Amino acid sequence: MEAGYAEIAAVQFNIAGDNDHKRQGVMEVTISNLFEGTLPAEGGIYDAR
């Protein structure tokens, strides 16, 4: 697969509800432990995802 060349023609602004946040987000923060070892703690706010 390849991503063809494209340009932005317009921008639409809207109020983002919780549904948009749930759909767009790639993970859910559950713990307050920032770091586990050198690598970021999984489920924290620095999760590599």
């Binding site: 697969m1 390849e2 063809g4 060349y5 494209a6 340009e7």
Partner: protein, 336 residues
């Protein structure tokens, strides 16, 4: 199933000067290199039939490279798999860890996950081509993957069936949309005619719900196959003949259309009942003639393709010897 689809995409051209020398050939080559053998827009691309439309080889404004881009709309052959499709050849790469899964060995690549919940699934062994039916869940065509992903179980003909009620008489000028499909089934039946009748009989009696060794063969010029049981001594009608009756424009479409488990699935015959003479496992579905006829035609096409693929892939008696244990699973499950 195999179908014609139209996509439209944008192709980046690294050397526009060389690309434009033979635009059609270069565009076809690029489309084949990029899209053939990958899942795109909920469809698996098999080959590129042609380029319906295209645009001039523009030059990228935003970047300072001389590279160009071309909007191309192309018609290709794609494979879409619905629910309940039957896949004759499925090799089990790894039946272990209470999870099962196998890869299709047909023109439409698929990765099917078989649950360990069912005992029949656990019985199957690795390196064994086991026929499989996809579950009711839709097939997941992740873009960019070279094979579709689905969940299925070893095909065990189920006794429960459904009855369809037609409230609208035959749709007029939609008989042509149905004829598009009768053509596909005709091609499938012509293909089935070539192979030997004995292997077809073997597989039909293996997958016939009510196994019959009587060797009695219902003979229809398009279709020949061993006969089954008779319910209420009722007379089924060939779907192809009723569709041909479109010239008459009268087809008695209202009557309940149903195919009992006894009635061979590959056979075009289906029973028409004025009332709910067929036992209704579920309340007869209130559907139009379009929905029903398309449904019955799809089911028969699925079963005919299943049978042709079964005959082709098990063309060796020794492979059948290995898979007789799978056959025993099906036979043990079969009741009558």
């Amino acid at each position: 199933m195999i179908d014609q689809k139209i996509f439209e995409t944008t192709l980046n051209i690294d050397d526009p000067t060389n690309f434009c020398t033979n635009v059609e050939a270069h565009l076809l080559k690029e489309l084949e290199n990029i899209y053939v053998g990958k899942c795109f827009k909920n469809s698996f691309i098999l080959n590129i039939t042609g380029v319906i439309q295209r645009s001039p080889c523009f030059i990228m404004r935003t970047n300072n490279s001389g590279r160009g881009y071309m909007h191309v709309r192309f018609s290709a052959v794609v494979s879409y798999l619905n629910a309940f499709d039957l896949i004759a050849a499925v090799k089990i790469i790894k039946n272990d860890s209470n999870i099962i899964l196998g890869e299709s060995l047909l023109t439409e690549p698929v990765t099917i996950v078989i649950p360990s919940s069912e005992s029949q699934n656990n019985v199957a062994e690795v390196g064994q081509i086991v026929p499989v039916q996809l579950a009711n869940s839709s097939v997941y065509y992740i873009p960019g993957r070279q094979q579709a992903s689905a969940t299925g179980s070893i095909f065990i003909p189920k006794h429960t069936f459904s009855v369809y009620h037609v409230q609208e008489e035959l749709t007029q000028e939609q008989a042509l949309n149905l004829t598009k499909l009768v053509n596909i089934i005709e091609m499938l039946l012509e293909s089935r005619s070539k192979k030997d009748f004995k292997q077809i009989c073997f597989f039909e009696k293996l997958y016939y719900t009510y196994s019959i060794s009587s060797d009695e063969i219902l003979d229809l010029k398009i279709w020949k196959g061993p006969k089954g049981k008779e319910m209420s001594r009722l007379k089924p009608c060939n779907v192809l003949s009723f569709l041909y009756d479109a010239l008459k424009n009268k087809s008695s479409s209202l009557g309940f259309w149903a195919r009992p488990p006894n009635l061979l699935k590959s056979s075009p015959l289906a029973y028409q009942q004025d009332q709910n003479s067929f036992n209704a496992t579920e309340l007869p579905i209130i559907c139009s003639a379009e929905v029903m006829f398309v449904t019955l035609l799809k089911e028969i096409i699925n079963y005919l393709q299943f049978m042709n693929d079964l005959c082709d892939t098990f063309n060796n008696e020794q492979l059948i010897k290995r898979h007789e244990n799978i056959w025993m699973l099906i036979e043990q499950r079969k009741i009558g």
